[PDB]
Design a protein around this ligand. Structure first.
Ligand SMILES: O=S(=O)(Nc1cnn(C2CCNCC2)c1)c1cc(Cl)ccc1F
Ligand SMILES: [Cl-]
Length: 78
């Protein structure tokens, strides 16, 4: 589980609520985005792990589905 809004989550879960797979933060495929570990070196944007780097309300990720830019991950708040 994650604490609070999930900003501090550093777990290795990488699956969305609909069962889709998280895109890697450093990847621009399928989604070209700017929430990269280059840009945000201190938000734990490792591999494709679920993260909340932008003060959303739970960890999320860009998805490997070109039609769905991002989703929340299948995680619960502690
Ligand atoms: O690369 S992104 O982070 N893409 C993006 C679009 N929606 N989201 C949501 C992710 C979950 N938290 C709410 C924003 C992220 C992004 C952020 C901003 Cl401020 C502007 C453009 C942009 F491309
Ligand atoms: Cl946490």
């Amino acid at each position: 589980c994650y604490h609070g809004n999930g900003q501090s989550y550093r777990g290795t879960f990488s699956t969305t609520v609909t069962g889709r797979t998280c895109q890697s933060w450093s990847s621009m495929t399928p989604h070209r985005h700017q929430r990269t570990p280059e840009n945000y070196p201190n938000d734990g944007l490792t591999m494709n792990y679920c993260r909340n780097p932008d003060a959303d309300t739970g960890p999320w990720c860009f998805t490997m589905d070109p039609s769905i830019r991002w989703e929340y991950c299948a995680l619960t708040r502690c």
